[PDB]
Design a protein. Structure first.
Lengths: 174, 187
């Protein structure tokens, strides 16, 4: 079940490259929750933010109006970061997928290769029984052909001996 | 589409099979060969019949004539010798009948093996192409695997890079909120 084809090796290496350097003993699970945590951390910020303009939008009824727009520029900047954060999650989904699919594909290749070696064994065994059968077939013909003549020859002689036998029998009745 | 034999062993069998086909089974056919026997089989049957018939007529003359055994001695001796003779013949007739049965069996097995032969070959060439295809697939798989491994790396980097600014401005904006919070408590 171990990579031999250079093609199987090169794949193996690529998967290990991720296992060894990038993931480094950290399941996709671990990384997903890492993103989830921070999307929450950010969820609660925008909450705080809108809640705390819920507090200025009443107490300005100026002195400050620029805060509304200073910290709405934010509300924008924040929206960007929240979508960066969600976009990130999408990627690590794609990652997870292509990763599993890499590993599966590599098991599959190896199996498929071993399968193809057997299929060849069976083919060969079959291509030899094919001869054997054609040699059996011949052995019978050869036999059959060496039984043809004995009868044809003998068969008249017998017919006569019997011709004669019924002669003798009819002769007594005299 | 490809169905032609390649492997040395395929040609060896194809050759063997084609050889019986061309210069023998055109030379003499398997239906012809059977009827040829199933005639003489049927001729030896009539002769067995003819013999068994005479023997009866013998046995019977002899049976009847033994109710005058002293008066019919020579007669009965002729008849016994005759009857003993026909068993000897019958016995030889029997082997010839058997010989001919085998002959019939053989030629029928000739066919059997020959048919199988043809099927057996076909069935190998299939398994070859099958294993050919599979090995082909194995490769394709070995390469999708790698292409998967790369698409995975590419995603992980997009993922890695995308989460930075988010990570880096987090507490920056926390303090920027809560600075603005106290500036609301006191005015």
């Amino acid at each position: 079940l171990i990579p031999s084809t250079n093609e199987e090796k090169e794949a193996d290496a690529a998967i290990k490259y991720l296992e060894e350097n990038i993931l480094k003993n950290s399941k996709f699970s671990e990384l997903i929750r890492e993103v989830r945590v921070i999307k929450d951390e950010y969820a609660l910020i925008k909450a705080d933010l809108y809640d705390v303009i819920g507090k200025i939008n009443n107490k300005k009824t100026n002195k400050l109006t620029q805060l509304l727009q200073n910290n709405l520029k934010i509300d924008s900047e924040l929206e960007q970061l929240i979508n960066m954060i969600d976009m990130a999650e999408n990627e690590i989904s794609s990652a997870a997928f292509f990763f599993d699919n890499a590993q599966k594909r590599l098991k599959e290749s190896i199996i498929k290769r071993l399968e193809s070696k057997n299929n060849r064994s069976y083919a060969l065994k079959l291509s030899r029984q094919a001869l054997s059968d054609a040699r059996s077939a011949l052995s019978n013909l050869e036999s059959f052909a060496s039984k043809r003549i004995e009868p044809m020859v003998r068969k008249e002689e017998i017919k006569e001996l019997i011709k004669h036998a019924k002669t003798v029998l009819e002769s007594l009745n005299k």
